[PDB]
RNA sequence: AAACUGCGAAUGGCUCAUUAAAUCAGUUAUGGUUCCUUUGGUCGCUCGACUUGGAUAACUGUGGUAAUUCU
RNA sequence: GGCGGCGACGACCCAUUCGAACGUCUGCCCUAUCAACUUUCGAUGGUAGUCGCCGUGCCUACCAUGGUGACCACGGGUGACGGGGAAUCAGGGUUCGAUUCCGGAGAGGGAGCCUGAGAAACGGCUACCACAUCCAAGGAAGGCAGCAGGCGCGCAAAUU
RNA sequence: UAAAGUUGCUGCAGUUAAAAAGCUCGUAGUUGGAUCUUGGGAGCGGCCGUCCCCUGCUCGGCGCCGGCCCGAAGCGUUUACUUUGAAAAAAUUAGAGUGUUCAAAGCAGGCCGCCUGGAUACCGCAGCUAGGAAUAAUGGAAUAGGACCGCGGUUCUAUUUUGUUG
RNA sequence: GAAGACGGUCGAACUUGACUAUCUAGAGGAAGUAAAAGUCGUAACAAGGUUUCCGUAGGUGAACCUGCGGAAGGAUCAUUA
């Protein structure tokens, strides 16, 4: 069908080649998943050898990680920002590896809340007025306290991150296949990775 | 595919001069001395002779 | 050879390959030109039909008639006068006969008085011309 | 071929089987098992064509299917298994013990031992791994995986193994100076100690091995087995003691023996 | 220097978002007695294909050619010279395969003539089976 | 017996049309892969019913088509 | 009421065997009345994906302008499947190898795919092209370059 | 196919039998001057024959009052060449044995249960390995960024090191 | 969870035109070769009755002839202070 032949193709020389076999079946290619943004449609496929692939067509959860401090949180996947391959891969909301996608930040938030104890985006003026989490920014013991100020000596966060936890919506790096794993996995950027694709956005956007 | 041998060789050679006299007439005396039947029967024993004495030839240029 | 270089394999390999070319039986084998224009398409031996019995006359010295046999070969559809052996045997074929025919002996070439007839019959009506002649086979009609 | 080749041409098959060319167009292909197609022994050759208690191989059938033929310690009831190199053919009936090494020439030997060194064979380990919890796994010539290895053990060791439970019992490390029976190329059956091991880094590494009488030679390492510490094997040896006398004393040897027996 | 690309460059290996208050860089020994260049370890520069600093194992095969032509990104020509013997003549006859070759650009001072070492890893590209291992320059070009 | 199930039917056999760095051969690599089968491991490692549920074929019966290993 | 022996089948994964697949190095007949070819309908390479069992312009997007050739590329031809081998033969050679072993390819020509570990299978299926069978004329069925055998083709080849 | 030394590498021819370009330059191709180690130390046979020696710096065994003799790694102008080694399906070919009644074949067989065979050679080229260094190529110091030496400066770095821990 | 449809993809085929590899028909033309004795001559071989031949022109029933330069394979190895 659609081949994945090399003898399909012109030698090194510049001379083509004649086919001395008619195509293969290892020699597949299958069309593209080309997945979505969406409620989960996960179909299965039957690959060489009797072994399973998941090709992802609508996929909106990710199991992403935050490097920084070890975290990975399962988050749901907003938008498609940045695509390295082509433009229309970003018009065209397709997850593929190595998209930059805007992902929900509130599992990293709540995480990071509940570990150093510091209200992390939240304008001032604007508290928590339900009383939620104001319970758990307070009401430890004496040394329980004092390992979380311990800790909270090393809980300074980017300026960059701070502002993207304040819009509740981080840039993330699918690092995963999407159309072969069926997973939408990968890791948040920091640092000069941020600093390069937050660039590549700007010079794109404006 | 089959389990048939095939491996079968011819035991003289036929001289290339058809009618030397010299050998015609020498291969006859052999023929009348020993009562052997036909000039094949000479061409077999002189076609073992000719490969015991190729054979002796490739023995000789090899080192004692 | 000219050129004794330790380095020199593919100018005496190359050289000899250009001039084996100027060779008469080389040439001819390895071109079409021979095989095509070959009336027996590179076969040995040819069935073809009698359409006519022909007198050729012999050569310049010598001087006798040679009874040949106009063929149209079946495999081609090409024309061939083919000579018939021995004395007496254009008595034995009857016009549109199926005569098996092979060369007469020198490869494609016209021998001794008989000018460019390169062939004999062999066989008549598939009965050997040697058994006709001894007269050991009859003729079946 | 679309798939896997299932049959195996007699004028195809490994040289050292010793079967002829007019029986038939097949020879057996051995069952996938332990050993190599070039390397084992099939047991309908071991029973028709070497011991010659069958004629044919549905005779080979009638006495594999009673489950007699114990193969290095269990029943085998499969006629084309490979048996293959220190493997234990227990013939239980007549009370017969074989164990398949090597002749000097180089096909393998019918070499009848005791039931007492039976129980035991020696493994060539090809490979060491770490399992999947720090557990140190062990595959040997003929794939008996072993977990829980002795930590000294390394890649081209031999193991004494006993049949009947599945345990090392000694090893013996790859060092110069220890016997050695070679188990591929042309000094297939040769015995001798081992000499210089010699590191190509990237290609082979040849190892060098000094034979009883003299006569060194050498061979690639994937090729070389270990049979004993220094002089003394750990098996009973075939006749001949993996030497390989000449054409010329092979010939004045048979001549000898010939007119001194009558 | 370096993300020209549209994608950011790095090494795969090494994270670069450990929380602080220069990028170590991830290089391997290629073995076979191969020193790895000074270069490569100091390197600011990212290759995938690199066999210092990236994702390529040379195993099987090492050669050697005269480096012909170095006008393409990060790969180069060598041309291997070789006598093949015609048995007929009993002469040889000088023959050549020209190979692309993938030159890490921790390989800096390389010039069209120096006899460059190659070893055989995975297929880089479609003609590509050879990444550069060592350089040493033409006999005598120092000037 | 039939029928469901399992396994095989990708081997063997035939032919040589196509194919000129292709095929093939020697030589390595797979630290770039896949692998029914055999062989040996593994198969209370997870802290959370003395055996369950709906069929369908063979069988019996009613057929249709001029016709099929149709149904 | 509770504890167990000898097997059979099943089973995720590792390994092993059986391979397969794609890569390395070097090696092929004639032809120059084929000297420049390949390339923005991928040519050589970069970067990031898609696809694939995985390595790869395999394929997409953006790049760079490469790549090969008088050491014969590129194009054409081959009564060219390659090889182990065969004939001839002082020593060199020349010619042959469809042909029982190895490897490849194809099942009238192309193409597409189901099942399965393995097929782009044809003593499987799906079309088209060519040919051809049965028909109550609505429809159905076909693939001997398997073993025999038949026609045809031929100089040329056996028993249903 | 040999005969055909009538395709000629071995090995043909080119004044007149067929054949040297009208002449010269000229790039790839092919070929390319001479030159760079020798004398003796150790030993045997009857002046001549056959052998061992004429590179150097981290880890232990025939020993010794930090190193001397030696064992095992690793760096050592680069290639062709030659010799050896590994490795290289059988079948074919050569070839060992063996009275298929002989032979072509076959892989068997022999002995009043035992013994024995199913060997071996060749497998251009390319690849791998280890000796030899003649022949051929290639190299090194010539505005000195030249060796072999010890020294004095400068950027980054194993810790043996302060009773256990700042 | 069947039919079915939109779109993509592989892609047989079909229509249209051009390019083109082989084979075949061809009024007529224009060659060559082969015959035992056709016609016009006699160009060449003897200084072949104008020495022959080469290149290049022109011409002419035909072989050929003539110009210009060249050759000896010439009919002179030589021709005399």
């Given at each position: 069908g659609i081949s994945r032949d090399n003898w399909h193709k012109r030698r090194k020389t510049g001379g083509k080649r004649k086919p001395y076999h008619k195509k293969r079946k290892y020699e597949l290619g299958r069309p593209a998943a080309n997945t979505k943004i969406g409620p989960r449609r996960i179909h299965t496929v039957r690959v060489r050898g009797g072994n399973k692939k998941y090709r992802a067509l609508r996929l909106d959860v990710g199991n992403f990680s935050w490097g920084s401090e070890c975290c990975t949180r399962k988050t749901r996947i907003i938008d498609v920002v940045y695509n390295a391959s082509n433009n229309e891969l970003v018009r065209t909301k397709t997850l593929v590896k190595n998209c930059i996608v805007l992902i929900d930040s509130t599992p990293y938030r709540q995480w990071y809340e509940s570990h150093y104890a510091l209200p992390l985006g939240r304008k001032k003026?604007?508290?928590?007025?339900?009383?939620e989490e104001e319970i758990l920014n307070k009401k430890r013991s004496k040394k329980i306290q004092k390992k979380y100020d311990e800790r909270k000596k090393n809980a300074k966060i980017s300026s960059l991150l701070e502002e993207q936890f304040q819009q509740g919506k981080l840039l993330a790096c699918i690092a995963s296949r999407p159309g072969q794993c069926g997973r939408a996995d990968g890791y948040v950027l920091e640092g000069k990775e941020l600093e390069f694709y937050l660039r590549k956005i700007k010079a794109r956007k404006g | 595919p089959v389990a048939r041998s095939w491996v079968c060789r011819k035991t003289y050679v036929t001289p290339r001069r058809p009618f030397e006299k010299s050998r015609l007439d020498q291969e006859l005396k052999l023929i009348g001395e020993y009562?052997?039947?036909?000039?094949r029967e000479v061409w077999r024993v002189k076609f073992t002779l000719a490969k015991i004495r190729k054979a002796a030839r490739e023995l000789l240029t090899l080192d004692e | 050879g000219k050129c004794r270089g330790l380095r020199t394999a593919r100018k005496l390999r190359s050289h000899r390959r250009d001039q084996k070319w100027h060779d008469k039986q080389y040439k001819k084998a390895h071109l079409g030109t021979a095989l095509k224009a070959n009336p027996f398409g590179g076969a040995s031996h040819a069935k073809g039909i009698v359409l006519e019995k022909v007198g050729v006359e012999a050569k310049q010295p010598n001087s006798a008639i040679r009874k040949c046999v106009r063929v149209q070969l079946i495999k081609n559809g090409k024309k061939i006068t083919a000579f018939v052996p021995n004395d007496g045997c254009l008595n034995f074929i009857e016009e549109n006969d199926e005569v098996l025919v092979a060369g007469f002996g020198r490869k494609g070439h016209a021998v001794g008085d008989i000018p460019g007839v390169r062939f004999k019959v062999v066989k008549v009506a598939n009965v050997s011309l040697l058994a006709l002649y001894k007269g050991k086979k009859e003729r079946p009609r | 071929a679309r798939g896997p080749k299932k049959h195996l041409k007699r004028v195809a098959a490994?040289?050292?089987?010793?079967?002829?060319?007019?029986?038939?167009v097949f020879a057996p292909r051995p069952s996938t098992g332990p050993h190599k197609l070039r390397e084992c022994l099939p047991l309908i050759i071991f029973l028709r064509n070497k011991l010659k208690y069958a004629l044919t191989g549905d005779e080979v059938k009638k006495i594999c299917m009673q489950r007699f033929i114990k193969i290095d310690g269990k029943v085998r009831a499969d006629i084309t298994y490979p048996a293959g190199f220190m493997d234990v053919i227990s013939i239980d009936k007549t009370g017969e013990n074989f164990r398949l090494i090597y002749d000097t020439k180089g096909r393998f030997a019918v070499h009848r031992i005791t039931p007492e060194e039976a129980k035991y064979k020696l493994c060539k380990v090809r490979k060491i791994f770490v399992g999947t919890k720090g557990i140190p796994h062990l595959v040997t010539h003929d794939a008996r995986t072993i977990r829980?290895?002795?930590?000294?053990?390394?890649?081209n060791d031999t193991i004494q193994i006993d049949l009947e439970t599945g345990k090392i019992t000694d090893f013996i490390k790859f060092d110069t100076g220890n016997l050695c029976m070679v188990t591929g190329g042309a000094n297939l059956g040769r015995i001798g100690v081992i000499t210089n091991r010699e590191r190509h880094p990237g290609s082979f590494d040849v190892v060098h091995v000094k034979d009883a009488n003299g006569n060194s030679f050498a061979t690639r390492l994937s090729n070389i087995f270990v049979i004993g510490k220094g002089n003394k094997p750990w098996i009973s040896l075939p006749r001949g003691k993996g030497i390989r006398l000449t054409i010329a004393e092979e010939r004045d040897k048979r001549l000898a023996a010939k007119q001194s027996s009558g | 220097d370096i993300q020209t690309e549209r994608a950011y460059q790095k090494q795969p290996t090494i994270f670069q978002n450990k929380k602080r208050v220069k990028l170590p860089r991830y290089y391997k020994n290629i073995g076979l007695g191969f020193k790895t260049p000074k270069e490569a370890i100091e390197g600011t520069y990212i290759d995938k294909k690199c066999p210092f600093t990236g994702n390529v194992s040379i195993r099987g095969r090492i050669l050697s050619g005269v480096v012909t032509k170095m006008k393409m990104q990060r790969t180069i020509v060598i041309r291997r010279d070789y006598l093949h013997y015609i048995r007929k003549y009993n002469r040889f006859e000088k023959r050549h395969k020209n190979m692309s070759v993938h030159l890490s650009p921790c390989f800096r001072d390389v010039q069209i003539g120096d006899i460059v070492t190659v070893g055989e890893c995975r297929p880089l590209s479609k003609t590509v089976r050879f990444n550069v291992l060592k350089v040493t320059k033409a006999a005598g070009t120092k000037k």
């Open positions: 003026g604007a508290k928590l007025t339900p009383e | 009562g052997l039947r036909n000039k | - | 490994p040289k050292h089987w010793m079967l002829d060319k007019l029986t038939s829980y290895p002795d930590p000294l053990i390394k890649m | -």
